[PDB]
Amino acid sequence: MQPSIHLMQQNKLIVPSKQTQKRRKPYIKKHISPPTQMKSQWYFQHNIANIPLLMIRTTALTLDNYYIGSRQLSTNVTIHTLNTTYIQNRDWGDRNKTYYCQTLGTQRYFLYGTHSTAQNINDIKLQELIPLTNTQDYVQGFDWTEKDKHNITTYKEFLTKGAGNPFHAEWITAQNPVIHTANSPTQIEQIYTASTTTFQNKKLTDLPTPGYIFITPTVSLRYNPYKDLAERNKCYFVRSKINAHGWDPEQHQELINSDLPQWLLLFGYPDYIKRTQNFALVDTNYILVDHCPYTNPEKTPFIPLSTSFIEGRSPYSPSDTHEPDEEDQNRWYPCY
Amino acid sequence: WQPKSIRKCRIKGMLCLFQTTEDRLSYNFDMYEESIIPEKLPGGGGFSIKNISLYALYQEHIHAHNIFTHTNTDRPLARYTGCSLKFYQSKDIDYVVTYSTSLPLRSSMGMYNSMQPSIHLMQQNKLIVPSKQTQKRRKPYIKKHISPPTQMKSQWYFQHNIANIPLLMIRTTALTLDNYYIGSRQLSTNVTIHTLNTTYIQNRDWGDRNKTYYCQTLGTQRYFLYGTHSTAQNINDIKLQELIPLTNTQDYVQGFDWTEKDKHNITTYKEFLTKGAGNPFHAEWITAQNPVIHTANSPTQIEQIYTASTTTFQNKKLTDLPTPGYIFITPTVSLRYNPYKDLAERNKCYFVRSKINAHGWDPEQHQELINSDLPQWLLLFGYPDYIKRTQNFALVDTNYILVDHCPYTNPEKTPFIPLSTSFIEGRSPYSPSDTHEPDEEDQNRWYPCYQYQQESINSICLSGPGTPKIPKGITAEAKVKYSFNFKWGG
Amino acid sequence: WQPKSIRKCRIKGMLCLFQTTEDRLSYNFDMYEESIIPEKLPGGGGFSIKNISLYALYQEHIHAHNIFTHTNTDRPLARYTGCSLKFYQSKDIDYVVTYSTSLPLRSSMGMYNSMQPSIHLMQQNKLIVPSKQTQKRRKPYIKKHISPPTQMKSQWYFQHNIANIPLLMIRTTALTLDNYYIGSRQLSTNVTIHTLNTTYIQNRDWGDRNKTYYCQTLGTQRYFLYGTHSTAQNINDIKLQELIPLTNTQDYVQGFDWTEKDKHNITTYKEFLTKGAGNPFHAEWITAQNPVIHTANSPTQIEQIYTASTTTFQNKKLTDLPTPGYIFITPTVSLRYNPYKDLAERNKCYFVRSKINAHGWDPEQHQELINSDLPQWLLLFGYPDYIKRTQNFALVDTNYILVDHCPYTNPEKTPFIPLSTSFIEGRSPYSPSDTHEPDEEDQNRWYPCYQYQQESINSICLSGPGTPKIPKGITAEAKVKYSFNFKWGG
């Protein structure tokens, strides 16, 4: 149905716009025969009521700006994506359950935001970090120094109230430094239950497991349809409401596409899935994924992210509403 | 002796000829669509060279831009009959086309020079495509039948035997029949060209933290440029503490005075030269907005002086340097040029390496890569892209730079040397006004180099007749529909 | 621009298409006439692939099978016009023909599969030649004119420049339009196939006097087959002295009991295994006419036992071996198969090396040499000869063996493994009944190998539709007269 492949289809009909071309009569008229199965005999009411008589396929295009619009700075489209090398947990949307980016073996890993001005990773103080500990909540978090502001008496209240959104505008893009580690905040729980005021001498390296890496949640890929083909690229849906890792299909192997380049391959695929499979919620229940080796920055599996979600704004609100709307305050997680 | 089974087969698809813009007016498109163009950087080209081959058509079908009327599977025999081209009218730009079917179909230096639109119209057997704005036709396309190449006879051939042989070569470029000799807001034809001041900037070795930059070397003595904030017009009273030497390139750093010693943790003047170094090409020094003094100082002399005593500079004057000569010399000058006042009695252009510690602007690479007998606005057109496609130099964009000789400017220097306005005003290329500083990527490449010639040589081309002066920030498309007739067999 | 002197020249001669027989029904003839076929061994083939070239015609003239109307001496220029073929009717067999003149004329795996007569008739642009018995025509030959290859134009060429280029490719096979789905004495369609019992015979390393043969190796334990003459059905009371181990292959030896110690000058049980070894594939053990017991004995255990004491075996029982398990396992089983009950939902066939000490019947040589989606009676047809001509393996006949997978037999084993009736009944191939023992030459090759698959895979092909079931011991000829038109020049 994508227009550029649609024109190649035989027995087509183009309708030039009045701006593109001025015709003598502003309409194209044709006679269409009945379906070849339906003979020219008589039938009852409510016996041919639901039988289709004519099926119309239409799409929009522009014969003038075929390969490029006008203000289009370039063809060179930027695609935001989840950093799938470290964000592998598909279970979001729970106040009670903390969010771990990935689980290697039986150890969970977490992302921590900090405001440290020192580039060293070992001197960053444990008080300054702002753990995620949740999703679905567009909350930016705050430092341990803000203990008095939110009526905090213990670090448990800090994690319940001072939790920050990993996907928040100040952390999704890594505008502020964010550190991935194997901290397992239960370790900090034990440390401050032993003594919470002793954190003045607690350093980032004192955690039982080493590894403190600046890992951004999302990266901006650069892509180009003229440089992209279809030697192996593929796309499909995966559930977003399960506590399982990996981005492989587990739902329906009949709902995998492949042998077209990305700009064609994506076209109409979500709506097709909506109409054919009738999944639980489609929009809210799960998410779409693809595999494309033809981007400048490439990750075996990919994962779109609208610019609105990356810049911290509700969808389809261009610039005026800089914060997520009232309705989506309880759904701000990677979702269709 | 026709084969047993034949099947008529057509190939129908839309081919995007070029997407051009003001900042990308005179570059070859078809070598840029294969390569990824970074976002927020205008690309494309105002002219394209097409070598349509059967393997190229199959590759296009892989990208899903065309269809086959009948598949060629298990029919190795092939037979070519001819092609039909439908040139669609662009909405707001004008393009002319021409096609050839000779034996070699090898692009040459003369062909790319002749690709410039005003000389392209003079070429015989042309075809103009008026834009819808320029003229409203009955049918918004020009259709013609093109015979196969005259060498390729009408016999049968194998698959992957005529795969790479060209069947049709298309030459296209953009123009504007209305604003032929001038755009509209074009204040005048009177184009300004920034150039390196080649009378004193003669060293071609940039891009080294360790090695200082000397503008020129006469005999065995090196000369250096120093920036100062002195408010006195006298050249002898300017204090030695106030000067800000260059001592480096490739670093967009503006420098600071000796009075700022405490700010950057400076204990010796060596730390001053390592940290307080300034870019000679910086926006506050390239244009000579602030005074800059050329001399034969040889900063090792100042090294000796302050190793003797650094605090004694309160009584050290500019004239105390062992070698005299302190001249206000701007790094770059703005020439005024006019294509109607310029001819081709001796002008010439060529490339020279930018990564060697040698002086002079003469060619030393390839005497076969010199052009001459056309005026500048024609002579430059497509010349860089020609060099990219033909010679395959090391990096082209980064390895070296282009130079010309033109006696027809108001201010004239035997050899010249473009400089895009972006590089002169201290901004990354193709960023119009918002990003006033060089980007993150080019912080380690801010030296005179081909990635900073772009807009200047493009404007030199643009000043010539027939250039499509479109509004800034808009992109113009040009689509062509191709129908190749084939007959698979076997 | 015709040459100065031309001379019309024809080439007339008789070409023997194939001489087939029941035991040689589905092999390519034209690769066997070049090689010497030993006397008293039927040869030929039921189908032939012909690549008639000018050099081939000259070679035929060297053998004096044709004539030239006019000599080509001192006339290097050549011109081809066309060929006329006269297909003579065979006396008592039916053959169909087809011809192609494409560019490559390279035989493929699909072509040789499609060569089987019942699928060959379905091919378009065919030609049937009824036998004189089947039908009496007015003129006992079919004559047609065949155009030159469509790539070869009607221009002039040099000698030894078109010498090796094919001019005409002939595909032929034998059939019988009368007995299409069944012969005559054919008791039934219900063909019996002997096969190696692959559930326990899994070792592919045969043909070594020094190395003993183990049927299979589970983990690190080897299993062996033992023949005995015990008249008691109990498996635990069978005495250890009565067993006759294999301990070798490639030797058609039946073995003997420990009681025959004196006959062969045996002093120790090592001499018993060196001399009293028996062939597991021998006529009295392959079919399990005499009981044979599979076990995990590992004869080194018996070595230890008799080195401790050899005369104490009077009290040694079969159960005293360190590892239990004594199963009556026949080396080969007779499957029943039917082409009308067999399809192609998953069946497959391929070759595997027979001269390696490795287990399993999976392919490890070439995944490009697997066939599948045809029923067995088609799938096997011409496949060995195709492999001979295309891959040029080490020895084909002796180096390795063929295997298939077919779930459609009454008794079914994931992988299968033909075995000609001759090898199962202990006789040399192609010797019907007179020579009851393997010949002198094959005394040192009597192991499962391609030289013993012949009649079985041939019978599998024969069971299919359209096979010319001729009487045993008769040979059928098929002669074709070819007339090539040429024009020498110079």
Automatic annotation (TrEMBL), chain A:
- Can you say where in the cell this protein is located? Virion
Q: Which family does it belong to?
A: Belongs to the anelloviridae capsid protein family.
Keyword Metal-binding carried by entry: no
Q: What taxonomic classification does the UniProt entry list for its organism?
A: Viruses, Monodnaviria, Shotokuvirae, Commensaviricota, Cardeaviricetes
**Cellular component GO terms, alphabetically?**
T=1 icosahedral viral capsid
| Biological function | Self-assembles to form an icosahedral capsid.
Organism of origin is TTV-like mini virus
* Protein name, per record: Capsid protein
Tell which residues of the whole protein are contained here.
Answer: 169 to 504 of 672
Keywords from UniProt, A to Z, are: Capsid protein, T=1 icosahedral capsid protein, Virion
UniProtKB/TrEMBL annotation, chains B, C:
Q: Which residues form a coiled coil?
A: none
The protein's organism comes out as TTV-like mini virus
Keywords of the record: Capsid protein, T=1 icosahedral capsid protein, Virion
What is known about what this protein does? Answer: Self-assembles to form an icosahedral capsid.
Q: What is the name of this protein?
A: Capsid protein
Q: A single GO CC term, please?
A: T=1 icosahedral viral capsid
Q: Where in the cell is it found?
A: Virion
Top-level taxonomic group: Viruses
By sequence similarity, the record places it as follows: Belongs to the anelloviridae capsid protein family.
